[PDB]
Every structure is written in C-alpha cells, then in structure tokens.
Design a protein around this ligand. Structure first.
Ligand SMILES: COc1ccc(CN2C(=O)[C@H]3[C@@H]([C@H]2C(C)C)[C@@H]2CCCN2[C@H]3c2ccc(C(=N)N)cc2)cc1
Ligand SMILES: [Ca+2]
Ligand code: NA
Lengths: 5, 250, 28
C-alpha cells in the first residue's frame, strides 16, 4: 500500500 | 473476487475498505449506509478462535476508492471510528449466525460522485427480490484466486440459490439469517467472493424503483469458487430490527 | 431519500455494463 498522509 | 471483472468508476459508491493501521493491510469490505454509519460482517472485527479482536483505534475506513493500493488523492476519504457495535447474538462459537456489525464514524463523510449510501431493504423489498435465480452483485479488493491481488475494485454478478441446494452443499448448520449465492456446476458460469472481500455488500437493483439495496453481507465460504460450493451471506433484512435499534439509540 | 441512486449512473440516467444481466434475472 501507498502511504496515507 | 474470483472470476469477476474490473469495476467501472463510481459503479459501487457505497463500497468501503476496512484498512488495518499497523501493519498496513486490507482487512475486509464494508458499506456506507448513511453519512455516519458503516455496515460490515462481525467476523471482520471479532473472531476469538483466531485471536481477532479489533478496537476502534486499530483501523481506518477508506471511502470512494477504486485502486486497491494507491492513495487516491482528491477522491477517497479516510475516516476514523468512534464506536463498533457487534450483534449481541453473533454466534462465532457454532455456525457464524447473525454475522453483522455496525461502525459509527467520528465525523460525517461528505457525499460525492464517488461516495454515496446504499439503501437497506424493507419487508416488501426482501419479499420481491430474495428469490432463487434472481441475481445480485458482490464487489471487493480481495483475492483473485483461492491459492494474486487486483489493481482495482472487482465486480461479479451471482444468482441466489434454492435453500435445499445451499443446505446440501455443506455440513454446517444453515439458519434463516443466511442465504447462499453462486452458479452450479452445470451452469457453466463462475464467480465468488474470497479473502479480503468479506464484510462487503451483496446488492440488488429493484426493478420497481430503480434503487440499489444491500440484501446481503459477505459472510463465509469453503474455499473460493469451488464447484458444488456456494458463498454464504448475512440476510440484512432479517437483522434490520437490530440495525434500527442501534442507529436509533446511538 | 437519495439512497441507492448513483451520481455517475442513475442520477444522470446512464447504465453500467452488467446491470441488465440483473434485470433479466428478475423474471417475476
Ligand atoms: C459457518 O462457520 C464458519 C465458516 C467458515 C469460516 C472461515 N471463514 C470464512 O469463510 C470467512 C472468514 C473466516 C471466519 C473468520 C468467519 C475469512 C476471513 C477472510 C475471508 N474468510 C471469509 C470468507 C467469506 C466468503 C468466502 C466465499 N464466498 N468463498 C470465503 C471466505 C469460519 C466459520
Ligand atoms: Ca447438510
Ligand atoms: Na462454487
């Protein structure tokens, strides 16, 4: 998963 | 979803991803039923045989998503949980009876092209639509095969199966709070939910008022897309008195 | 009041690629 801000 | 296809943009705007914070992973599907309430399977939050017992702080709700792994900037919304409500008679000890849970969000989510609530059926909706042969729709970011993972949300349409056929396919005791769906060996077509999809919605489009209704929740199965087996779903209408009681009280 | 009506489909009177399959199964 791409990191969440 | 096994033997499904890529969803269209905005095809399932009620679709919710339940996302574990640490480590980062897909936990389950779920659905948006109002600006503040999310519906899922109880087994997504509580299953003591596998030491599963999530608290509100363990997970996040991601809404309006299409891509499985990407952070969909300016599109998806990320929400925190205020409180989890598990059906008090959820039977994880025997046969997973009443496999249903609610999550109240810390703040209401704004609706958009990509984010919009599904309807819940009433008695008449359930009587009209919950018939053997009638097809509903299952969506999720789960496994593509029993034994990888999709780039985008997957969709499959599946027929409701006669209760005797559901009963005869399994050694498990089936209750009135469950139904099963899927194609038979002789039908040639295929498709099922799988790991990652559970908790997600089984929906039907009423031909009387052209609205989508969530008739089922992805509950349990034996493998995924096996010949002679069917996916089992929580019967949403049968549990609606509980849903209403929780929303009315809290 | 607006539940179950999709902004990108029912709201603008567009159909998705497989919703007809569902309608065709509702034979009563
Ligand atoms: C009726 O009694 C039971 C039947 C099956 C199971 C095993 N389980 C399932 O089938 C679902 C659940 C697990 C548990 C945690 C519910 C896990 C968590 C991730 C996915 N998996 C669920 C699951 C749900 C649907 C299908 C399917 N339609 N093939 C296959 C699996 C456990 C109890
Ligand atoms: Ca049996
Ligand atoms: Na099957």
């Amino acid at each position: 998963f791409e990191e969440i801000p | 979803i096994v033997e499904g296809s890529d969803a269209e943009i905005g095809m399932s705007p009620w679709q919710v991803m339940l996302f574990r914070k640490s480590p980062q992973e897909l936990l389950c599907g779920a659905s948006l039923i109002s600006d503040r309430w999310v519906l899922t399977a109880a087994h997504c939050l509580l299953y003591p045989p596998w030491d599963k017992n999530f608290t509100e702080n363990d997970l996040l709700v991601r809404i309006g998503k299409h891509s499985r792994t990407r952070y969909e900037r300016n599109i998806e919304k990320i929400s925190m949980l205020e409180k989890i409500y598990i059906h008090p008679r959820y039977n994880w000890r025997e046969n997973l009876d009443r496999d249903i849970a609610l999550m109240k969000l810390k703040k209401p989510v704004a609706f958009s092209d990509y984010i919009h609530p599904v309807c819940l059926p009433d008695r008449e909706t359930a009587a009209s639509l919950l018939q053997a042969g009638y097809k509903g729709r299952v969506t999720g970011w789960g496994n593509l095969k029993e034994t990888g993972q999709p780039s985008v949300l997957q969709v499959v349409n599946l027929p409701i199966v006669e209760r005797p056929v559901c009963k005869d396919s399994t050694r498990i005791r089936i209750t009135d709070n469950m139904f099963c769906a899927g194609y038979k060996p002789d039908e040639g077509k295929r498709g099922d939910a799988c790991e990652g999809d559970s908790g997600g919605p089984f929906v039907m489009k009423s031909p009387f008022n052209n609205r989508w209704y969530q008739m089922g929740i992805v509950s349990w199965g034996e493998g995924c897309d096996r010949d002679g087996k069917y996916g089992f779903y929580t019967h949403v209408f049968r549990l609606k008195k509980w849903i209403q009681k929780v929303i009315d009280q809290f | 009041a607006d539940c179950g009506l999709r902004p990108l489909f029912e709201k603008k009177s567009l159909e998705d690629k497989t919703e007809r399959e569902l309608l065709e199964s509702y034979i009563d």
